[PDB]
Write a protein that binds this ligand. Structure first.
Ligand SMILES: CC1=C(C(=O)O)N[C@@H]([C@@H](C=O)NC(=O)Cc2cccs2)SC1
Length: 253
């Protein structure tokens, strides 16, 4: 759409867009197969894999960690080095706060980046490219994915048959109660419409959000809005994501 082109113009950015209405199979797409750094959006898919690997009771396993496991942003993990945290608590911290140390701890428990990639290939994701911890130039392929691949993989875990219903419920609930995305996809969606999302931010002004959006009534939409900019130290604007989401909803409604 020229509306997506206008936003790229307005915000001096590159936009990556894929949306799928699961009720009608109607699609919206702008650079849907273009690679962007996935940043923290990978945390959603990581918990997907963790849930697939553990019974719900297994999530109560206590993980002990050290101050050495702490990285750049540890909002929940910094508060519990002495007592440790359960896998369930770590998943909550990772998804709802984008706790980087929590993600690293979980990634360690599922066998590292190489193991995550293998499990993603197993669900049919041949594009998402986990390679390093955390993670996080143009245009290398690590650690990247596309808008299309991200909605496909998110839909697989949360809405389809890569997880049983009770584990599906956990993933969806954590993402519904995310604290980090109020100004992104949530801001571009109509009032009283449930949103489950996971945000991302990274170098080259990379600003991402992936989401499942429920109507009042009807089948959910799943959406990826990815973005990046020219310079390594470029700053992002959340409004780009919110506005892109409005454009997507208009083209679907
Ligand atoms: C802003 C932010 C998020 C997010 O909104 O999801 N996620 C965490 C992570 C994932 O993208 N980003 C980084 O570790 C890299 C950055 C640090 C601070 C500004 S970007 S830390 C910072």
């Amino acid at each position: 759409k020229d509306d997506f082109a206008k936003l790229e113009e307005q915000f001096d950015a590159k936009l990556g867009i894929f949306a799928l209405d699961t009720g009608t199979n109607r699609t919206v797409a702008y650079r849907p197969d273009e690679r962007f750094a996935f940043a923290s959006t990978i945390k959603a898919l990581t918990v997907g894999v963790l849930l697939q690997q553990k019974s719900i009771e297994d999530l109560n396993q206590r993980i002990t960690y050290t101050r050495d496991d702490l990285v750049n942003y540890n909002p929940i993990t910094e508060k519990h080095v002495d007592t440790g945290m359960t896998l369930k608590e770590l998943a909550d911290a990772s998804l709802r706060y984008s706790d980087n140390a929590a993600q690293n701890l979980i990634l360690k428990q599922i066998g590292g980046p190489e193991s995550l990639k293998k499990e993603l290939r197993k669900i049919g994701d041949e594009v998402t490219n986990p390679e390093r911890f955390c993670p996080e130039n143009p245009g290398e392929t690590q650690d990247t994915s596309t808008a299309r691949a991200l909605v496909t993989s998110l839909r697989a875990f949360a809405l389809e048959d890569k997880l049983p219903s009770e584990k599906r419920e956990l993933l969806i609930d954590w993402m519904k109660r995310n604290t980090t995305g109020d100004a992104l996809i949530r801001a571009g969606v109509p009032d009283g419409w449930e949103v489950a999302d996971k945000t991302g931010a990274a170098s080259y002004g990379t600003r991402n959000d992936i989401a499942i959006i429920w109507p009042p009534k009807g089948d959910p939409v799943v959406l990826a809005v990815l973005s990046s900019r020219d310079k390594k130290d470029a700053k992002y604007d959340d409004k780009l994501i919110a506005e892109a989401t409005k454009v997507v909803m208009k083209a679907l409604n």
